[PDB]
Write a protein that binds this ligand. Structure first.
Ligand SMILES: [Cl-]
Ligand SMILES: [Cl-]
Ligand SMILES: [Cl-]
Length: 163
């Protein structure tokens, strides 16, 4: 466990994190993919051996001793808002189980389904709240990654609101 479990946000490439494991914003087929998934493939390609897993689940594959937790959010181009919301909440609960099982003291996590899976919508709040629902009961230090300056400010504000 971390001494004083916390949330933080950083605006940078999650492939350059300083945490004990990474959550990939994976596709269901374990393909190199786009966005976060492509940066994770470049940095940890060994972790895509048998990484394919269904929507709403997470599958961990070791790169050396470094855990890559492949978390598959729904593509809101394909899902209804209602079923999409259910699967996005489920993917984060599976992330919390894996982070707990691994016994890490820190984890780097992106906002699932906010990129090319967002179906053209701003899902910062929806995705972040499902992240909190899942990770609040874990004692790992959580570091949320983003790339947009206005997203960094909104994520930071949401963290500070609860403190
Ligand atoms: Cl960066
Ligand atoms: Cl995405
Ligand atoms: Cl972003």
């Amino acid at each position: 466990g971390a001494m004083a479990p916390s949330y933080r946000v950083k605006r940078m490439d999650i492939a350059k994190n300083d945490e004990e494991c990474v959550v990939n914003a994976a596709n269901p087929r374990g393909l190199p993919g786009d966005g976060v998934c492509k940066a994770v493939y470049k940095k940890w390609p060994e972790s895509f051996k048998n990484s394919a897993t269904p929507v709403g689940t997470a599958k961990t594959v070791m790169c050396g001793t470094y855990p890559v937790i492949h978390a598959v959010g729904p593509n809101f181009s394909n899902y209804t808002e209602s079923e999409g919301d259910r699967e996005l909440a489920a993917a984060y609960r599976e992330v919390a189980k894996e982070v707990t099982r691994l016994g890490v003291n820190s984890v780097a996590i992106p906002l699932l389904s906010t990129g090319v899976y967002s179906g053209g919508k701003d899902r910062l709040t929806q995705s972040l709240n499902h992240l909190f629902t899942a990770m609040d009961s874990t004692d790992a230090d959580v570091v949320i990654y983003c790339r947009d300056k206005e997203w960094e400010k909104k994520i930071s504000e949401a963290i500070q609101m609860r403190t």
